[PDB]
């Protein structure tokens, strides 16, 4: 049996970037044909690993992460990047080895009236670490102390993406899949 990539990329529902979800893909040999030549993907960059050679790999231990972001935020799904997405929602290690995939989902994730189901975090004390995930929704104060609304200087940290079918491509929704490759040599004990 081959690795079930279709259930990741072709899944019906995708999550908000702040609540990005991770699928382990192992105990399978991967047929990368479906990603290599397609008309499906608008963005496809690989980092650290050879973009040409992924079908050669033989001992697969990959993690697939899924989320939705706005077109201009796809730039932030890269190593060493700054911004509200990279800092507070999904951070990629400098040493990243793996691939970053995204495709326009305007016709299925945006509406003329506006789809506000997708969310991102925009306030946080301190940047996420690589592959860290934060689904907390607690009130935020710019001085770090605890906080109870409706007190002054007390804010909620999540906000909606608003996806309309009339905006430019930079504001249209994009489904993203990040494939991370475990290190090839892991020491369990001495």
């Amino acid at each position: 049996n081959l690795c079930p990539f279709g259930e990741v990329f072709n899944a019906t529902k995708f999550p908000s970037v702040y609540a990005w979800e991770r699928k382990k893909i192992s105990n399978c040999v991967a047929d990368y044909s479906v990603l290599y030549n397609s008309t499906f993907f608008s963005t496809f960059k690989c980092y650290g690993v050879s973009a040409t050679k992924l079908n050669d790999l033989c001992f697969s231990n990959v993690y697939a992460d899924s989320f939705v972001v706005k077109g201009d935020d796809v730039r932030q799904i890269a190593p060493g990047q700054t911004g509200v997405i990279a800092d507070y929602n999904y951070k990629l290690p400098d040493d990243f080895m793996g691939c970053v995939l995204a495709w326009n989902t305007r016709n299925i994730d945006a509406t003329s009236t506006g789809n506000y189901n997708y969310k991102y975090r925009y306030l946080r004390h301190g940047k996420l670490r690589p592959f860290e995930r934060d689904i907390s929704n607690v009130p935020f104060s710019p001085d770090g102390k605890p906080c109870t609304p409706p007190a002054l200087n007390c804010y909620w940290p999540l906000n909606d993406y608003g996806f309309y079918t009339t905006t430019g491509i930079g504001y249209q929704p994009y489904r993203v899949v990040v494939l991370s490759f475990e290190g090839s040599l892991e020491v369990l004990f001495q």
Partner: nanobody
Amino acid sequence: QVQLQESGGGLVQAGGSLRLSCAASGRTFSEYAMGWFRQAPGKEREFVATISWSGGSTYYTDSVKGRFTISRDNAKNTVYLQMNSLKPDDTAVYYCAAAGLGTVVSEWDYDYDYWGQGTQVTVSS
């Protein structure tokens, strides 16, 4: 050192065809992705199509989906853009562009490191 040059543009009229070409130099052409961009007068430069180093995977902007065809010739060190059923909207200066290391495909102008000068394409009606 590493440069592109456009060719094959000109005057055509609505419903005709035009076959753009772009020759590259400076490194191995078969190791990088290429992409076509265009800029209507006044409006900002937008993306048209992109081809992988192998020619296997492609992607197009919607305004041309079904009409335009991107293909390459690694033996010939050049990538083309067949344009059918042109419409006055398609008037633009067409920029050839080459991607960087690790970029399989991209519709994003910031992911291409080298740009050609552009060839005029005018469709009139």
